[PDB]
Each structure stands twice: as C-alpha cells, then as structure tokens.
Amino acid sequence: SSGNAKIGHPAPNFKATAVMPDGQFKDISLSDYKGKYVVFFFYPLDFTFVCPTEIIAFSDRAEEFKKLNSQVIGASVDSHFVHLAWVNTPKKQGGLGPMNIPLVSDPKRTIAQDYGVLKADEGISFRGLFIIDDKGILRQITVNDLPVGRSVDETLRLVQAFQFTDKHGEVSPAGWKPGSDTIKP
Amino acid sequence: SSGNAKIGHPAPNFKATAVMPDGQFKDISLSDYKGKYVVFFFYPLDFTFVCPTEIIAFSDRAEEFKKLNSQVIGASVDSHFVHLAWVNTPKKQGGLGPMNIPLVSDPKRTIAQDYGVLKADEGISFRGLFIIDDKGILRQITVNDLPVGRSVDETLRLVQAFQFTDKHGEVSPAGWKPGSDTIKP
Amino acid sequence: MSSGNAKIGHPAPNFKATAVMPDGQFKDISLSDYKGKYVVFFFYPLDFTFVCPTEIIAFSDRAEEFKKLNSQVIGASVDSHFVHLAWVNTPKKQGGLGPMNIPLVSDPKRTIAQDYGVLKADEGISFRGLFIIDDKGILRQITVNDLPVGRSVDETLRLVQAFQFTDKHGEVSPAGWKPGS
Amino acid sequence: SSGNAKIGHPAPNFKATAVMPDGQFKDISLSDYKGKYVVFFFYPLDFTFVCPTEIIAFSDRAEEFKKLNSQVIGASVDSHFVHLAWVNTPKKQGGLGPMNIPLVSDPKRTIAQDYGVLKADEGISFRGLFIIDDKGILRQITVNDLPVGRSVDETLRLVQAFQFTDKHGEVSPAGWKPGSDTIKPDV
Amino acid sequence: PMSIHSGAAVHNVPLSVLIRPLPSVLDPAKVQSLVDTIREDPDSVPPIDVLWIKGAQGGDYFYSFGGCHRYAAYQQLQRETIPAKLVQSTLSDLRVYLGASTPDLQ
Amino acid sequence: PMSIHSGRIAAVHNVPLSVLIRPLPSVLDPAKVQSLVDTIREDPDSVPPIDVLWIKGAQGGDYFYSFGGCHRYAAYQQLQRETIPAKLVQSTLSDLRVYLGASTPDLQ
C-alpha cells in the first residue's frame, strides 16, 4: 500500500506539535479534522537552498481549499522550533515567510514511516501528498522523488472529484419501478 | 514505500503477456524498455459499465509521450484474451475500441502486489500510476481510490519535470574558479 | 491429501462469489445456498479463449436433465463477473458463449480454485475440474482433466443418478421382520 | 492437487508386488510402463459381498485398452496373497475369476496416500482412477465415494482424447506462409 | 449494434431517478452529434446500461456509470426519460465503481 | 459484424485446410454443419473467417493452430475445399500451453 497508509482504510492518525498560521504552537491530530477533507503533504527539509515555491503555492491558495471544506497541512522531520524560525525568516533571505497552513513537526520520523515516505538513508520525507476524506479515509497517494514538485491545480481536481462522488452517494430510494407500463417497444 | 516499489530504487520488473496496439500477443518485460521513460498505469477491471475515457485519453495522446521518448503501458488482472476482446468490442457497445498502448495482463496478481496496488478483498488493482526513468528507476507513485481518474496533462508535467532534472545532470566540470579576480567590491 | 482442501465424504468447501445468473443479472451466491439439491460444480480455465466452448454449452443446453434430477449445474473460472457477462452477451458466431441456462461463478481471488485443488499456480487459472456435491453438502466425486480434454454431460448424469440411487435406499425404517433360526 | 499426484507433473512412482494375469507374482513399478498410457485404478477391498462387475468390465475389455497402446492396472491395500486367492475363487462363489489386468498390492498404504485416495479412518482406497501418458505424466484424476463405480467407456473416451491431442503435437512446420498470393480481397 | 453488458427488456427510465456519481469529461462535439441522431433516428442510439441495486431494507437505486455522451444528449434535449436496459446487481458490484464513496444503501 | 479475436486485423487469408493444426477433438451437431455447408455454397460472404493462432517455434518454424470455428471448418471439409478464409493472430508458445497443457509440443 504505502508503509501503513492503505487506500480505502482510515488514514494513519498522528499527534504532533504544529506551527499554526498565527505563529503559535498547537498539538494537533489528524482525527481533529474529521468533518473536513485533508490534503496532508510532506516536504523533505526546512532551510534548504531551494525557492520553497511549492509550499508557498499551497499557502497562497489555501482559500480555494477552505472553499471546498478541506484543510491543507504541511509536514517535515524538522522540529517545531525550526518550522517557526523558517516562517519568521523572510523569503528575501531564503526563508518561507508567513503561512496560511499549519506545519507539522515529525522528529521521531514515525509519521513519515506510517505514510511510507521516509527516505531511510537520509532520515527525511520524500515529496508525499495524501488526500483524506471527511470520514478520515485515505483516498489518494501521491509520492514524487525529491526534485519534482506538486501542482495545487491537480490537488484541487482530486479533492473536487472525490467530493463529487461522495455527494452523489447521499441518495434516497428511487420511488420508481420498472414493469409493463415502463417498457419501450 | 508501495508494497515493494520504492522511489529511487529500480522499479519491480515484470514479465507478462500484453495485447500490443497491432492486436498481437507479445511477452514483454519492464526491462525491455530501458532507454525510455515508462508511464506504467493499472486500472481495476476490463468490461465494467464505466465509459473507459481515462484509458482512451492515454491511448489518444500516446503521440505526446512518444515525443518525450516515453512509453505508456496499461495493466489489469484480466487475461490477455479479455484485453483483446475488450479492444475488439466497439466503444458504442461499452467496449474500449482500438489502442495505441500495450495492455499488460496480470492474472497471478503478482505485478499488482509488487507495485502495492492490489485491493486484496476483490482481487483487482487500484488506479495506480508509476513513472520509471530511462535507467529503470521509480521516480513517482500515484494511487487513486477506484472512482477518480488520472490526468494525461499532470502525467506529462511529471515526465517533462523528471526529464528536465535528468538532462541538467549531463554537465562537464566548470572552466571557472573564484578568487581575488572574481570578487565584487 | 484429497484435492487441495476438498475431501471425499467431508462437506464440500463453501464459497461466496458473484455469479452471472442465466437471466443476465449479478447475484451473490454460496454453495450452502443449494443445500437440498445435488450440485455439479465445474471449473473451466478462461473466458474468451479461441476454443469453441462446446463443453460449457452442452451443460447449459442439457440443464433441464439436471433440474429433473433435482441437481444444479454451476460453472466457474477466475475471470471477473463483468467478463462472464461480456462472454455471455458475445454471440457464438463471433467466438463468444451465447446465453446460458446455468450460473457462472467468478473466482478472482483464486481462493475457490485453490480450495478445490484445481489452481494451476504458474498461469493463475483453474484446470478442468468437476465436483459432485450431494443434497447435504458432502463431496461425493472429484474429476480433474488436464486442459485439452473436456467432460461428458452423460458421464456426469450417470454419476448424479448413481449417487442419488444409493442416497435414496438409505432412507430406511427399522425392519418390521425377524428370522426364526 | 491429489495428496501428491499433480496434473501435468510426473505421476508418483510406486514399486509393489502385483498378481499378473498369468497367476505369477512380479515386482512392478509405474516407471516400467513408460512408452504406454496407464489407466491406474484403486478399489477399496478384495472379497467384499459386492458383485465385482466394475473390475471385471476393465478385465473383459482389456483388449480395447491394449489396442490404444495403454495398460490397465488395478490396486487395493490387500496383500498379493489375497489378490491371488480372490482371482482363483470363481465368480459363482463371490470371487473375481481370472483377470487380463495385473492387480497391485499396497499393504503399507503409501501408494493410496501418494494418489490422495486413502480413507484414513478405515485404511482403504476410495474408488480412484488416474490416467498417465506414455511419458509418465498425470493427465486425469477421477475419485468416487465408495458406492459408485467407474465406466469403461468414459475411461476409453479420456484415453482416446488425451492420445488425440498428444498425436497432433508431433508436427513439422507448415511449408506454407501468408503473403500477397494468399490474401482474400474485398467482395 | 446492441450491448455486451445487457445482450431483453428495454425501459423508459426517467433521467431524474438515475444516480450518476462519476464525473463525466464530455467532448461537446460528440454530444451535439448524438443530439441530432436522437431527433433524426432514435433507433440508431443503443439504450444505456443501468445497474438496479437493492439496499439493506429493500430500497431501489438505479446507477448509470456508462453512456456518458448519450445521457448528456438526452439531458440537452430536456427529455423526461432515456431508453435503458436494467441489470440487477449487488452492493458488492457497486463497491468496484465507488470504493470508499460507496454509500450504506437502505 | 466482426469477431472479438481479430476485429482490428485487416488481413483475411486463404489458409489451406491441410496446414491448420486442430489438436482438440470436436463434438459437431451435424444439423449446424449441414446448415453452414448450404450458406457457404449459397452466400460465402455470410460465413466469417476462422481465427487461427500463428506461433513461431524455437528455430523460427511456422505453426498454424485452429481451436475455434469447429462447425465452419467441418463444413469446408465436407465441401472438400482446398482453403478456408481465416484471420491470423500472432501468438506465443506460452499462449499455446493454456490450450494443450501437457500435450503442448516443443515447437522448432
């Protein structure tokens, strides 16, 4: 499947310290977000030399996910102290800038391992993204090798598509039956 | 990782009977396609009641993958006899129509299991897609629950992106060195 | 021993599986659904092969003769129920099966083939296995042919009648009669 | 499969004392019969109260199997001494009478177990029949519960059918190829 | 010119009772094309295959997964019904199409 | 209209009955044979071509296997015709093993 994350079974729960968008530390769980779709995405490392345009895209367009009643959550193996430092380092100096999404800290590497995206040899997450429905069931697995980023558009397409199918399963009995009277000659 | 398929390690090899686009049966291996990028995608079942628009999109736009020196290969657990029957059933009657991509037959469910996309209880593949580079290394894992399809555009984006990064690793040593003469005051 | 898990004289291994019924509907059937009837349960390798499926058709055509003997014929292969349906709705003239008077069981997990000991491991398909199961769900007969040789409807009827004959002369009350010496 | 006997793999070899049709004891092996098709059939017990019409049918019609270059061999768990006694007991007295087929003795019950037809609780063979080709490969498994016998006709049908398919595999390349000259045009 | 999902009874199924839970990517050329073939020659267009599934308390549900273009055409012509062949099926068949979107049908 | 073994194959060939290998015995209903024999004399273009498997041996030898069109083959055999219309489908020695099992020969 993916280390422990199985399509159609409940997404592995984590409890972890996150840096919320207001700059506070909160202890959140995936189960805290039952009732909402969750886009849970790992990135390798804070404070690398790469323009973090991928993470920023998800933060910038967080409104479009809130409109679809879904929460975007980012994660890496870096401490919450590091996440906070990276947020409060301005982009101009190779930082991240402020965020509209919470950033989860996975220092024990247990969450990365549960979602099957731990690169063992370097002790860091691959570029993994997981879509989890309002009932906490895993619906989608995306995992990219380190050099290739994820599209916010493709992520929205998937969330809308899963939600579409979810919605046309709120159905009442038909009130109609076939028989002599309904047959086409 | 994904059952046995690990990002950055060589993609699990299969040998399987495929229905080629000319309507012949050939015994192909993933290793047959070293030197080309491979988009290897599973779909659940032949002859379901769904318009198979996803498979057709990949067949229709196979030219765009050939242009990028990559081969698209489809797979399901159905026999090669079934694949052939589905191809030779016209779309108008809920068949597939002719194909520009080979369709791999996985009746022992070993290939589905190796790529970690076997839904155990029904004995069928999830909607899994894998990108494999010219050296036979797994670069990308996509796995959707059954009701949501894959984008040909997003697949091309990933193949171009991996190929871009692959290409800017054909580099010669720099003719240049820093020192007193290169410093900006 | 025996046949993978199917033992003569013990209860036939139960399956639950999606079948294509003769009316063209999908139903979820179990072997246990047919207690009270004799069952002729037969595997064939694959749907949509290049062989005239004359063997399966013979059993479908002569299904009346089995119903007369209060027995149900059931066919099975590892192909999905979607495939069974497609094969039924493909006319014989184009190398299909045509309509059926018997249900066709779908065994995609290959668990049923394995239980009856007729799974050819290397190709992931059933041998030509046929099993006779009595009204009490007990396995009475095992027939397994290599792939190129088919089964006779007549020999199958002979076996069902013979087992039923012996079954019937075992519905006995104590004897009202005694010898004198 | 069947205890140890697998369709398409070589039939389990036995070495056992048999009563031959001439009334002698010989030590035979299944491997002795490579080059011939073998119909190897178990029956439960010698000297039961049943008219042994099934065994007699195979003996009586042994010529029809010899014509198809196949050997019928019977087997039970009874000693060779018992087989001989049963042969030399006339039918009129509930014996077997003389035989045109050899009868194999399986007193260790190893052969019955290998072919997966040992009824553990009574220590006797079910009514098992196995068809084995000229190369010693198992092609057919028939096993009946005790009260139902086997047809000589159905056995011949199977032997002829396997032999038919065997024969149309001794083939040379066609000496024909498709091309311009062989194509049927549109009409 | 029929179907390999329903090769006897064709019904006039009201578009309003068909559940179509899979999003359709429709090529409006093929839709417009069929819309004309429906007005000009109804007997050209096969009936769609709908799955008739009974809930746990016997409630009837009619699922359309196929004839994506045909359905779209009859929808454009704001028709009340579409020709369809019904195939009775199980809740376990439905799980193959919907996965974790499969509802708990009553 | 057109077979689900050879629909997307253009080429129909006139295959001599004497090069087709038919290794599976046929149970023919002589009513259906006699019926087709008439449709062949009256209207040849009624009767589809048979599907034959074209399999190459280990040394490139060609073999043409007919497992289907049991009745059609029987009809052209009765009319002592030299050839039968057939669509060729290239296949592997591993495909052939599904049909013949332990009768599968070691094709050269």
Residue numbers in the entry:
A (entry chain B), B (entry chain A): 2 to 186
C (entry chain D): 1 to 181
D (entry chain C): 2 to 188
E (entry chain a): 30 to 36, 39 to 137
F (entry chain d): 30 to 137
Sentences from the paper on this structure:
Peroxiredoxins (Prxs) are highly conserved and abundant enzymes with well-established function in protection against oxidative damage and emerging as regulators of metabolism, signaling, and DNA stability. The studies presented herein focus on the primarily cytosolic isoforms, Prx1 and Prx2, and the mitochondrial Prx3 isoform. These proteins all belong to the typical 2-Cys family of Prxs (also known as the Prx1 class) with a common mechanism of catalysis involving an intermolecular disulfide bond formation across an obligate homodimer. In the reduced state, Prx1 and Prx2 arrange into decameric, toroidal rings that contain five head-to-tail homodimers, while Prx3 forms dodecamers (six head-to-tail homodimers). An equally important cellular process is the repair and reactivation of the hyperoxidized Prxs by Srx.
In order to determine the full decameric Prx-Srx complex, we generated the Prx1 C83V mutant, selected based on previous studies showing that the decamer of the homologous variant in the bacterial AhpC peroxiredoxin was stabilized. The most important part of this strategy was to convert all of the remaining Cys residues to Ser in Prx1 molecule (C71S, C173S) except for the CP residue (Cys52), and then to treat this Prx1 variant with DTNB (Ellman’s reagent) to generate a mixed disulfide at Cys52 (CP-S-TNB). Two 341 kDa toroid-shaped decamers, each composed of five Prx dimers and ten Srx monomers, were within the asymmetric unit. The 2Fo−Fc electron density map confirmed the presence of the engineered disulfide bond between Cys52 of Prx1 and Cys99 of Srx, a mimic of the thiosulfinate reaction intermediate, and a phosphate molecule within the ATP binding pocket of Srx. The structure of the dimeric building unit of the Srx complex with the Prx1 decamer was similar to the structure with the Prx1 dimer previously solved, with the Srx molecules sandwiched between the active site surface of one Prx1 monomer and the C-terminal tail from the adjacent Prx1 monomer. The remaining residues of this predominantly hydrophobic pocket come from Srx (Leu82, Phe96, Val118, Tyr128). The crystal structure of the decameric Srx-Prx1 complex revealed for the first time an intermolecular interface that increases the size of the binding pocket for the partially unfolded Prx active site loop, which contains the Cys sulfinic acid moiety and Phe50. Thus, the total contact to Srx encompasses ~2100 Å2 from three Prx molecules, which amounts to 28% of the total Srx surface.
